[PDB]
């Protein structure tokens, strides 16, 4: 999703419909980054 | 509506007044689905035990087929109680 | 006594497959909504197993009485192996599978634990239809 | 475990005690063997009453195990 | 006949009908007919 997202958002011919779309993909990736430190800190029922 | 092919022709196709009244007796309603079958009618194939494994195995495969027409065959599994009153005409017809 | 526990564990692999086929989007509106709750059923069964899978480091488990632990616990899992057949009859969809799920929502009445899963799946599955 | 004759010196008398719990035992193995297999509304010969009957019969056999296994082996 | 549910089911246990009449009776299940009425109308003339 990251590789598709930056490789489509870098394309200036891809337009606003596509740039805002991949910006939404970026923000959903930023929201996705939350739980990866939780999975850390619960080791610092799960099983 | 379309009683020409499956009621008039089916009434005319019999080898034997109720010539036109048989379609009114078998006047089907196309808006229904009311089968009179039950799970007790599954033992109708047990009387024909010529090869009962390949007489009992067919019903699960016919149910596993994606057609919903296997339900009204409860009376048709028993069929006619007269001795070969439908089955024996094919041997005369093949000649 | 291992083979007493084998079929529930076997049943789980049919139901996580019912996720990863019936939640690919080609099957139909009613069908994806069933797998949307079968998502919940696999984590429910694995959360159940997470109440036991810790225990080997302290020895509470035993081979005879794991049957006693699993006998009320299959009802979260071992209903759904049949719900697979209920969609896999002809790749059924739409109202023509909701009729079968409708009559399956009243199906088992003597034990009466297989009714609720079909009922609760019909609630999720019929809503978008 | 019928050591007929010799067998490390225990007489006919103990065989007549052991072959009593053969009667209780084979009736538990066979009645539990009879009650063990479910019907699932699927055996074709067994209307649903028989399912509830066999369930209560397994409740009884579970109580029987719960009694046997509570028993200290430190008894004659 | 010429169908998987019209032809295979017509010769399972003991079998035997007229083939065209058997195909018409197999097609009558899709015509939403009451199972007893068509058989009674056939048996009242045959």
From Swiss-Prot, chain A:
Q: Which domain of life is it from?
A: Eukaryota
Q: In which tissues is it expressed?
A: Ubiquitously expressed.
Query: Can you say where in the cell this protein is located?
Result: Cytoplasm, Cytoskeleton, Microtubule organizing center, Centrosome
How the protein assembles, per its UniProt entry? Component of the gamma-tubulin ring complex (gTuRC) consisting of TUBGCP2, TUBGCP3, TUBGCP4, TUBGCP5 and TUBGCP6 and gamma-tubulin TUBG1 or TUBG2. TUBGCP2, TUBGCP3, TUBGCP4, TUBGCP5 and TUBGCP6 assemble in a 5:5:2:1:1 stoichiometry; each is associated with a gamma-tubulin, thereby arranging 14 gamma-tubulins in a helical manner. Gamma-tubulin at the first position is blocked by TUBGCP3 at the last position, allowing 13 protafilaments to grow into a microtubule.
Q: Which family does it belong to?
A: Belongs to the TUBGCP family.
Question: What's the stated role of this polypeptide?
Answer: Component of the gamma-tubulin ring complex (gTuRC) which mediates microtubule nucleation. The gTuRC regulates the minus-end nucleation of alpha-beta tubulin heterodimers that grow into microtubule protafilaments, a critical step in centrosome duplication and spindle formation.
**Protein name in UniProt:** Gamma-tubulin complex component 3
State the species of origin: Homo sapiens (Human)
Tell me what gene encodes this. Answer: TUBGCP3
Curated annotation (Swiss-Prot), chain C:
Tell me what happens on changing residue 75 to C.
In CDCBM15; uncertain significance
Provide the free-text tissue specificity comment from this protein's UniProt record. Answer: Ubiquitously expressed.
The subcellular localization recorded is:
Cytoplasm, Cytoskeleton, Microtubule organizing center, Centrosome
Q: Which domain of life is it from?
A: Eukaryota
Transmembrane regions listed in the UniProt entry: none
Q: What is the effect of changing residue 39 to C?
A: In CDCBM15; uncertain significance
Q: Which family does it belong to?
A: Belongs to the TUBGCP family.
Could you describe the subunit structure of this protein?
Component of the gamma-tubulin ring complex (gTuRC) consisting of TUBGCP2, TUBGCP3, TUBGCP4, TUBGCP5 and TUBGCP6 and gamma-tubulin TUBG1 or TUBG2. TUBGCP2, TUBGCP3, TUBGCP4, TUBGCP5 and TUBGCP6 assemble in a 5:5:2:1:1 stoichiometry; each is associated with a gamma-tubulin, thereby arranging 14 gamma-tubulins in a helical manner. Gamma-tubulin at the first position is blocked by TUBGCP3 at the last position, allowing 13 protafilaments to grow into a microtubule.
Q: Which disease is it linked to?
A: Cortical dysplasia, complex, with other brain malformations 15: An autosomal recessive disorder characterized by global developmental delay, variably impaired intellectual development, speech delay, facial dysmorphism, microcephaly, and varying degrees of cortical malformations including pachygyria, thin corpus callosum and subcortical band heterotopia. Most patients have generalized seizures.
Protein name according to UniProt: Gamma-tubulin complex component 2
Gene name tied to this protein: TUBGCP2
Curated annotation (Swiss-Prot), chain D:
Would you say which domain of life the source belongs to? Eukaryota
Localisation: Cytoplasm, Cytoskeleton, Microtubule organizing center, Centrosome
Query: What does the record note on quaternary structure?
Result: Component of the gamma-tubulin ring complex (gTuRC) consisting of TUBGCP2, TUBGCP3, TUBGCP4, TUBGCP5 and TUBGCP6 and gamma-tubulin TUBG1 or TUBG2. TUBGCP2, TUBGCP3, TUBGCP4, TUBGCP5 and TUBGCP6 assemble in a 5:5:2:1:1 stoichiometry; each is associated with a gamma-tubulin, thereby arranging 14 gamma-tubulins in a helical manner. Gamma-tubulin at the first position is blocked by TUBGCP3 at the last position, allowing 13 protafilaments to grow into a microtubule.
Q: Which disease is it linked to?
A: Microcephaly and chorioretinopathy, autosomal recessive, 1: A syndrome characterized by microcephaly, cognitive impairment, underdeveloped retina and choroid, and epilepsy in some patients. The more anterior parts of the retina, near the periphery and pars plana, have a grayish hue and diminutive vasculature similar to retinopathy of prematurity. Visual impairment becomes evident during the first year of life.
The UniProt function text for this chain reads: Component of the gamma-tubulin ring complex (gTuRC) which mediates microtubule nucleation. The gTuRC regulates the minus-end nucleation of alpha-beta tubulin heterodimers that grow into microtubule protafilaments, a critical step in centrosome duplication and spindle formation.
Swiss-Prot record, chain E:
Q: Does the keyword Cell membrane apply?
A: no
Highest taxon listed in the record's lineage:
Eukaryota
Q: Where in the cell is it found?
A: Cytoplasm, Cytoskeleton, Microtubule organizing center, Centrosome; Cytoplasm, Cytoskeleton, Spindle
Tell me where the transmembrane regions lie: none
Q: Which UniProt keywords apply?
A: Cytoplasm, Cytoskeleton, Phosphoprotein
Q: Name one GO cellular component term.
A: gamma-tubulin ring complex
Quaternary arrangement and interactors, per the entry?
Associates with the gamma-tubulin ring complex (gTuRC) consisting of TUBGCP2, TUBGCP3, TUBGCP4, TUBGCP5 and TUBGCP6 and gamma-tubulin TUBG1 or TUBG2; within the complex, interacts with TUBGCP2; the interaction plays a role in gTuRC activation.
Q: Which family does it belong to?
A: Belongs to the MOZART2 family.
Q: What does this protein do?
A: Required for the recruitment and the assembly of the gamma-tubulin ring complex (gTuRC) at the centrosome. The gTuRC regulates the minus-end nucleation of alpha-beta tubulin heterodimers that grow into microtubule protafilaments, a critical step in centrosome duplication and spindle formation.
State what protein this is by name.
Mitotic-spindle organizing protein 2A
């Amino acid at each position: 999703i990251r590789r598709y997202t930056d490789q489509r958002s870098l394309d200036r011919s891809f337009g606003l419909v596509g740039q805002s779309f991949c910006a939404a993909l970026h923000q959903e990736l930023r929201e996705y980054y939350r739980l990866l430190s939780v999975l850390h800190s619960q080791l610092q029922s799960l099983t | 509506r379309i009683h020409h092919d499956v009621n008039e022709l089916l009434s005319l196709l019999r080898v034997h007044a109720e010539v036109y009244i048989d379609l009114l007796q078998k006047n089907r309603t196309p808006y229904v689905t009311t089968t009179v079958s039950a799970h007790s009618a599954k033992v109708k194939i047990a009387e024909f035990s010529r090869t009962p494994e390949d007489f009992l195995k067919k019903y699960d495969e016919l149910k596993s087929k994606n057609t919903r027409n296997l339900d009204p065959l409860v009376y048709l599994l028993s069929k006619l109680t007269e001795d070969k009153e439908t089955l024996q005409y094919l041997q005369q017809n093949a000649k | 006594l291992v083979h007493r526990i084998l079929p529930v564990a076997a049943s789980y692999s049919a139901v996580t497959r019912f996720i990863e086929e019936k939640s690919s989007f080609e099957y139909g509106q009613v069908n994806h909504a069933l797998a949307a709750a079968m998502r919940t059923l696999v984590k429910e069964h694995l959360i159940l197993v997470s109440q036991l899978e810790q225990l080997h480091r302290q020895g509470l488990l035993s081979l005879q009485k794991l049957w006693f632990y699993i006998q009320p616990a299959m009802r979260t899992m071992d209903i759904l192996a049949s719900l697979a057949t209920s969609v896999d009859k002809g790749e059924c969809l739409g109202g023509s599978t909701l009729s079968l799920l409708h009559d399956r929502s009243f199906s088992y009445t003597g034990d009466s634990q297989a009714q609720e899963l079909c009922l609760y799946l019909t609630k999720a599955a019929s809503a978008p239809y | 475990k019928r050591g007929v004759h010799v067998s490390g010196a225990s007489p006919e008398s103990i065989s007549s005690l052991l072959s009593e719990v053969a009667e209780y035992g084979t009736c538990y193995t066979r009645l539990s063997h009879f009650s063990l297999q479910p019907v699932l509304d699927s055996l074709y010969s067994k209307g649903l009453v028989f399912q509830a009957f066999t369930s209560g019969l397994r409740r009884y056999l579970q109580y029987y195990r719960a009694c046997v296994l509570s028993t200290p082996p430190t008894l004659s | 006949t010429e169908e998987m549910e019209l032809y295979e089911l017509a010769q399972a246990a003991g079998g035997g009908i007229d083939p065209d009449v058997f195909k018409i009776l197999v097609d009558l299940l899709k015509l939403n007919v009451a199972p007893l009425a068509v058989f009674q109308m056939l048996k009242s003339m045959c």
